[PDB]
Amino acid sequence: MDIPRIFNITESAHRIHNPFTPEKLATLGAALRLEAGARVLDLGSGSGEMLCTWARDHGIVGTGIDLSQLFTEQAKRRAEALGVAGQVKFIHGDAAGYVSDEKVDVAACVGASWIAGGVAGTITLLAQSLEPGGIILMGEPFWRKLPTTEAVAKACHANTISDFLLLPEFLASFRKLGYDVVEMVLADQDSWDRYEAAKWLTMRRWLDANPEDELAEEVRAQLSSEPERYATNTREYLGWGVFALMAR
Amino acid sequence: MDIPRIFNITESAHRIHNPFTPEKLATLGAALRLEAGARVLDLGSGSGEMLCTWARDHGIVGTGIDLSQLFTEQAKRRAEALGVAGQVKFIHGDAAGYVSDEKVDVAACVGASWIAGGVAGTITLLAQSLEPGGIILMGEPFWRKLPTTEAVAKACHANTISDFLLLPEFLASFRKLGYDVVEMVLADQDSWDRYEAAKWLTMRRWLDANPEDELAEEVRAQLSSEPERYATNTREYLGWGVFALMAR
Amino acid sequence: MDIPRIFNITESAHRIHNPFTPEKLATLGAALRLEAGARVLDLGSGSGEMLCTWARDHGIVGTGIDLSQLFTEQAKRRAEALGVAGQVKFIHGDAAGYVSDEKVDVAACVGASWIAGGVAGTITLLAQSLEPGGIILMGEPFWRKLPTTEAVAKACHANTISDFLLLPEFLASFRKLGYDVVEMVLADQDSWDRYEAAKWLTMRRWLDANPEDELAEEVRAQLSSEPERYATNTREYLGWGVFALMAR
Amino acid sequence: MDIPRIFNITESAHRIHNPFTPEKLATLGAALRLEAGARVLDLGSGSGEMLCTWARDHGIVGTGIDLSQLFTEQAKRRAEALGVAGQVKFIHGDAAGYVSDEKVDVAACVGASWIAGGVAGTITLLAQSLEPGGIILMGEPFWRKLPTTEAVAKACHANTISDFLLLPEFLASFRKLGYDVVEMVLADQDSWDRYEAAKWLTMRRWLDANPEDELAEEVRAQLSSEPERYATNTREYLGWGVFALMAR
Amino acid sequence: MDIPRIFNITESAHRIHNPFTPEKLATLGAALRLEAGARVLDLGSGSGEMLCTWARDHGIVGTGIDLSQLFTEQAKRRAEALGVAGQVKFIHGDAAGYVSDEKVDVAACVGASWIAGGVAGTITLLAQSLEPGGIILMGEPFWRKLPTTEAVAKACHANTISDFLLLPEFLASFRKLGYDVVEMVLADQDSWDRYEAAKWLTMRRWLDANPEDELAEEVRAQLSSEPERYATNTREYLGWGVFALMAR
Amino acid sequence: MDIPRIFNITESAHRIHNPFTPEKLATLGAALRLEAGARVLDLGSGSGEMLCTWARDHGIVGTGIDLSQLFTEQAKRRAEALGVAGQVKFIHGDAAGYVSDEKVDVAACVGASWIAGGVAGTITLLAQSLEPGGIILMGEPFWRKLPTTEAVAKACHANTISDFLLLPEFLASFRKLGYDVVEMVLADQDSWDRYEAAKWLTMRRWLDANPEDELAEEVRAQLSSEPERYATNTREYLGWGVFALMAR
Numbered sequence A, B, C, D, E, F: 001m002d003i004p005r006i007f008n009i010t011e012s013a014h015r016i017h018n019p020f021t022p023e024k025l026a027t028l029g030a031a032l033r034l035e036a037g038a039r040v041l042d043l044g045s046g047s048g049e050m051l052c053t054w055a056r057d058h059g060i061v062g063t064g065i066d067l068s069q070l071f072t073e074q075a076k077r078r079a080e081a082l083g084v085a086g087q088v089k090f091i092h093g094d095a096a097g098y099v100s101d102e103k104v105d106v107a108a109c110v111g112a113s114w115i116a117g118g119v120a121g122t123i124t125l126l127a128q129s130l131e132p133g134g135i136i137l138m139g140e141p142f143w144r145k146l147p148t149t150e151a152v153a154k155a156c157h158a159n160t161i162s163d164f165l166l167l168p169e170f171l172a173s174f175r176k177l178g179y180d181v182v183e184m185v186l187a188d189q190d191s192w193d194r195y196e197a198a199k200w201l202t203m204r205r206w207l208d209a210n211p212e213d214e215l216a217e218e219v220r221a222q223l224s225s226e227p228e229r230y231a232t233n234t235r236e237y238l239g240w241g242v243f244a245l246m247a248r
């Protein structure tokens, strides 16, 4: 099995499947003070950009599990291209209930927390793989500012305003779970632009090539509506970041 | 050991050590559809009013653990007075890490969640005592409305506004923990008045009797300031309720 | 025929199918100054709680018509349980166009006014059964405060904001129909909680028992979303009450 | 002498001539921790509901003075009906300057403070009857929220906004007089509804019976206008409560 | 009998006794798609401008009843002046309870609904004269925008804000009565100016001619105050229109 | 081919298929200073009211293309009725890509700009038919005021708020295209009422005649909801006008 086809089409040219730039991803690697040889587990690892670049830049080793066949293949090509295939392994499969045999120094789920039914569930899962004194990484949305209506929330892929919290309350929610927040690297509007806008070029080039595809009608509708939807709703209201956690 | 002396002085005449009336407490018992013989565990059971009245009215049995020696003694006198000592047992002691040998149908912590380091920790503790298909009860504050300043928060015994959530987000926080909210009974302003205002009469009568006590100066200052503090801050801004939870 | 199955599932454990507590229902009985022997007609009588309790407490007699087979059966069991079956009769059927042969002192429709196509139509219908000098009872929603968006209205089971009025304008609407408002008993937030929150426990227990039912998917979705929806929309914005009317 | 006829007509069926329910009145009795044998003086005692019910429920004894002949007669019938005539005495007369020979444990004026020219004057009067260590009870209005215009104030039976204070400032005003506030029981909107709405049924039934009375025109005008006036002005803006005071 | 003298003085030179221009009145005639021979009943027909002009322009026939002797005489002169006396009949008298013997295609009350005690009563009366498939016309005020204070309402000849509704809620009120709104023609500020400002010239010319009349003092006061009152209150806040209704 | 059936049903009795009165349409003709013999092309000409009335009043000649068979037939009957069939020709067909052989003095698209994929596309198309020094006419919506939510936009037949602009920005958009705005005639609320309200009478009369039509259910739902929807959304927020353009 796989993820739905439309995601593979829309994000086929993304290295990072989230609102983070390469510069943010490198900032995060350095913020974690990763040492050579550190072991990383990444559940929902996308196209392996985090593991591949940290292997290259910090000498880490690790494993990435992802449900997408396409993105798994990209991750493997990426590790070859960077010269780090010896350090990082990519597995195509479902990461639900995944627990590592050898403990890791960093256990991450960067924007895939439905794997264990939400943020708390995912933290509990990742904790099972974690070396005492290690770090858990959660990549998650929050309100950059509070939407004025529930409709802005539904245009940001939530059901209600209560699905997300403003940053102080979101940070508080990790504390209330039992964790210290020990680091964080947040998206800014420019990093959101990178994630969203790149989909538009990808979609248009796909559409030009696939005018009689069963999905061409749907894609054409998305391409038409997305820039304005994104600018009106997401760009102003939706925050995102990676939060580093250690259990008290 | 015990709780600090000032709490015993201020609340010596309270049956319910929270912003709930007798009528709210009975509403809660009926809302839970308690059957005769149902087993209840109550961590931080106060003066045993919940266990004693539900024993009388619904035929439940149970155990209440409380750190206060005074309130434990009151709970035992209450059970005798109601004719339910055969059904409900009160233990003087620290409820931290308390796990029941026999499972219970209802496992409760009504305004004492620091016992396991917060709401999530306490839910996890209570779950260890719970019969499959049972209910967890959490009695907790939330924002009735959002304070306009951090100072209102500090006047409501929080450190920051982020310590509490508005009701929709608070309900969402239980869902995000993995629980369905299956019932709730909330304080209203009248029930808050019962909890707070009763302290003033108690304090004044204590003060009249104990003019040379080491605490008389402190109590005199509290009595003077409390009604206005309460009316300005708590009465308008601070919500409270009991939430009934079942793990999904 | 019957009402849709989902209502029978959700409300199977409700005595009162509206945002009124037992205490509100008793307040209403006393507010009407009901005399022993007074005759009451109740169209859309639910589980007969109003007729049964007023029979017990005030010595009234009457008839309740309801389309639900389940709720009719409950009403009949309730009258037996209270010792008032001699005083109150429950009929399973459609109350549209129902006119009593003997006149009544109180003719009521408590939250079922679609029976005669709305509030005005229902008042006109009930008037046909009414003794000169009798009282008409209408149980109806109104805006507790004005929603800020049409979406809050649609989340409160209206189509538009104009479907309901703020209380002064709603009271004015009865006056403009030709009636004096002679009494009223309104829901508060606690009574709304009783009506809504009780559905959640009922639904969860049903779901646990009926995992392969054709409705399990729908019920699971409702249970997940309802507490937050209710707290965000209904609890703050939607009013409800019973209004007592006499024609000028 | 007597009170004006219109008040006797409008309130002839009220047990409590203020925005308090029976449940609030009983809450107040218990909040005061009244002991059997405690002596109560009630100036402007209405229909004696406070004295009669506290005699029945707490074993108090006392005296109620009221200017209304009707309400005095009702109070005497009430004490007989409850079996407490031996404990409570009702006197028809003017309570201005009334000082008790035997001291009392509770000296009350519940919504009649014009007797001594206002709140401060009335407190000073009641203090003359009070046992050292006793409680003074004042039943008084305040702003539940601040009216936006002087016209809302005049529709709430004040002359100006400055006639009343918001609750914190009102509580402060007792402190500034020299008293600790030691307890309080406040009206809510439901208790206001009980007080106001009951007048409408009373008025309509009176009007039906007295179509050619000199007051029928005035009463008809009041009945027409009151529900909307009440809902627009009083229900949202006007607070009321009973405050228990002890001199510092 | 007649209407009070001051109205006859103020409006003696008006053809249309409402905030409608001739152009609005003609728009309304065409909007109703009146056919030659259609029968119209007009209760409170003023100076007969609606009947006379529709007779001339659409070939309708009809009857107008008005309580003013003056305005009845004007209506009769108007029908002669337009050459339509054969088509339209004006009757001086009270239109309360008026029911036509022959049914009509259009039954109208344009700003005189106190005749049957309000909008609903008047609709019910007009319905008695109506051919199945005919139209009822109601000319009524509503809030163009919501006044900020009750005083603006009293300056617009209402008692309270709740006397009128904003247009969406007003339209909803007809729907809730059982009627489809099938057409409407609304006043604008210019049509209000025509109705109000014309009174000022009339009043001044009357005053110049009648300096010792018993009403000269009152008229002088009105003339002085009206333009500013009108501009401050009515022109911005008060809406008006004619609504065409058909029973569902 | 044709337009969908529902439009033909709803607008069968409209001469002007837009929020313009006859008086606005005549104002526009005079504003353009049309000379006898001037040639006009009208793409999406509706029922030909613009061409027919300008032929009659200004002596213009022209051609109207419309996709509706019904509205084309009406246009031809209209030209006969006005005595201008010699001057104006109506063609049933698709106006997309339509370019005139003889140049015209006025090239118009009045509320049909989807013909060339929007305002800019339509201007470019019309320009191909235009005599140097001629005028292009575009009939288009804009925001009369900015909706407070995207839902108001969707209730005004847009997808997002960004679909339309406030008038200054809308006028700027023509300037930014390369055109001077040389004249304009805008709808007001009364002209919107004419366009929308007339649909309600048409729909009701259709419904009365066609109770078993496949569309009766849909039409009944529209008739019920439209007046309130229109008053809440369109009447206050949606602007419309005809803008006269000359290329710089």
Ligand SMILES: Nc1ncnc2c1ncn2[C@@H]1O[C@H](CSCC[C@H](N)C(=O)O)[C@@H](O)[C@H]1O
Pocket: A003, A015, A016, A017, A018, A043, A044, A045, A046, A047, A048, A049, A065, A066, A067, A068, A071, A093, A094, A095, A096, A109, A110, A111, A112, A115
């Ligand atoms: N059950 C599952 N197990 C593993 N991966 C899953 C999954 N469900 C979804 N995914 C993957 O979760 C990812 C979410 S996008 C984030 C990917 C990556 N962390 C990055 O930032 O680039 C997708 O790559 C998708 O393929």
Ligand SMILES: Nc1ncnc2c1ncn2[C@@H]1O[C@H](CSCC[C@H](N)C(=O)O)[C@@H](O)[C@H]1O
Pocket: B003, B015, B016, B017, B018, B043, B044, B045, B046, B047, B048, B049, B065, B066, B067, B068, B071, B093, B094, B095, B096, B109, B110, B111, B112, B115
């Ligand atoms: N570590 C601990 N173990 C058990 N009880 C504790 C405790 N720390 C505080 N408490 C108790 O927690 C209670 C908080 S007040 C709430 C008490 C009770 N549930 C009621 O509603 O009336 C106090 O009674 C206090 O004695």
Ligand SMILES: Nc1ncnc2c1ncn2[C@@H]1O[C@H](CSCC[C@H](N)C(=O)O)[C@@H](O)[C@H]1O
Pocket: C003, C015, C016, C017, C018, C043, C044, C045, C046, C047, C048, C049, C065, C066, C067, C068, C071, C093, C094, C095, C096, C109, C110, C111, C112, C115
């Ligand atoms: N046409 C109809 N005739 C009679 N009852 C109807 C009906 N349509 C719906 N109902 C009933 O109307 C009720 C609405 S709920 C309110 C029920 C009751 N008055 C109470 O307050 O508890 C339901 O019990 C439903 O069964």
Ligand SMILES: Nc1ncnc2c1ncn2[C@@H]1O[C@H](CSCC[C@H](N)C(=O)O)[C@@H](O)[C@H]1O
Pocket: D003, D015, D016, D017, D018, D043, D044, D045, D046, D047, D048, D049, D065, D066, D067, D068, D071, D093, D094, D095, D096, D109, D110, D111, D112, D115
């Ligand atoms: N001068 C006076 N002396 C005694 N009673 C007076 C008075 N002037 C007014 N009253 C009484 O003051 C009362 C005010 S209403 C409040 C009555 C009562 N405390 C209750 O809550 O029900 C009326 O009963 C009226 O008769």
Ligand SMILES: Nc1ncnc2c1ncn2[C@@H]1O[C@H](CSCC[C@H](N)C(=O)O)[C@@H](O)[C@H]1O
Pocket: E003, E015, E016, E017, E018, E043, E044, E045, E046, E047, E048, E049, E065, E066, E067, E068, E071, E093, E094, E095, E096, E109, E110, E111, E112, E115
């Ligand atoms: N009881 C009654 N019966 C008939 N006409 C009445 C009436 N009471 C008032 N009127 C008339 O109602 C009218 C209100 S003014 C509106 C008049 C007319 N429809 C127009 O628009 O011009 C006045 O002409 C007044 O004379």
Ligand SMILES: Nc1ncnc2c1ncn2[C@@H]1O[C@H](CSCC[C@H](N)C(=O)O)[C@@H](O)[C@H]1O
Pocket: F003, F015, F016, F017, F018, F043, F044, F045, F046, F047, F048, F049, F065, F066, F067, F068, F071, F093, F094, F095, F096, F109, F110, F111, F112, F115
């Ligand atoms: N492709 C197309 N070619 C020509 N006319 C079209 C069209 N698509 C829609 N229309 C027409 O465009 C019109 C939009 S309504 C406006 C019509 C006219 N200008 C008036 O103001 O009255 C309708 O008459 C419809 O029939």
Ligand code: NA
Pocket: A188, A189, A190
């Ligand atoms: Na940036």
Ligand code: NA
Pocket: B188, B189, B190, D188
């Ligand atoms: Na309350």
Ligand code: NA
Pocket: B188, C188, C189, C190
């Ligand atoms: Na309450």
Ligand code: NA
Pocket: C188, D188, D189, D190
């Ligand atoms: Na209440």
Ligand code: NA
Pocket: E188, E189, E190
């Ligand atoms: Na105008």
Ligand code: NA
Pocket: E188, F188, F189, F190
């Ligand atoms: Na206008």
